[PDB]
């Protein structure tokens, strides 16, 4: 496992994700912050897209890419330190995948399904109903949003692959 960082490049080329599993990893930020986005410059409901944030407990996270949408899921009131993936794909207009940030590093895992499709994976330990607990282990497949669209990186990040 090669682990490199902190990288400060603002773009990860889609072509660098197609041959192996890639972890995008972040030291726990001190406040809510947008981490990355895959999608066009302006929201386009016909294309798949996602936008990843870190959310600090007790704060409100408002999507940038989805700010021109009308949907309950365009914001998240964080009740734990967490990762928040705003995403749309297929018939799904907008959902948010939230996992709790349990350690001093967290992020997402990208598994290439083919040269134009990625599986985004997120996991974390959460509580609900007070003292009920769940290991959330989630994934969704995304086609490349459109030709030439890469991954915008908004904060320094670590890269893990084999």
From Swiss-Prot:
It is found in: Virion. Forms the head of the spikes and mediates the recognition of specific host cell surface glycans. It is the viral hemagglutinin and an important target of neutralizing antibodies. This is Outer capsid protein VP8*. It comes from Rotavirus C (isolate RVC/Human/United Kingdom/Bristol/1989) (RV-C). The chain holds residues 64 to 224 of 744 of the full protein.
């Amino acid at each position: 496992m090669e682990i490199t960082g902190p990288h400060t490049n603002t773009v990860i080329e889609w072509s660098n994700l197609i041959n192996t599993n890639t972890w995008l990893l972040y030291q726990k930020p001190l406040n809510s912050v947008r981490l990355l986005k895959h999608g066009p410059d302006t929201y386009n409901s016909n294309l798949a897209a996602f936008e990843l944030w870190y959310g600090k407990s007790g704060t409100t996270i408002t999507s940038v890419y989805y700010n021109t949408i009308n949907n309950q899921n365009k914001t998240h009131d964080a009740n734990s330190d967490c990762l928040i993936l705003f995403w749309n794909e297929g018939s799904t207009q907008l959902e948010k995948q939230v996992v709790t940030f349990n350690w001093n590093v967290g992020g997402i895992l990208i598994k290439p399904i083919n040269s134009s499709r990625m599986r985004i994976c997120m996991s974390g330990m959460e509580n609900f109903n007070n003292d009920s607990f769940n290991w959330e282990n989630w994934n969704h497949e995304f086609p490349r949003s459109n030709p030439g669209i890469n991954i915008n990186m908004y904060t320094e990040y670590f890269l893990a692959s084999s």
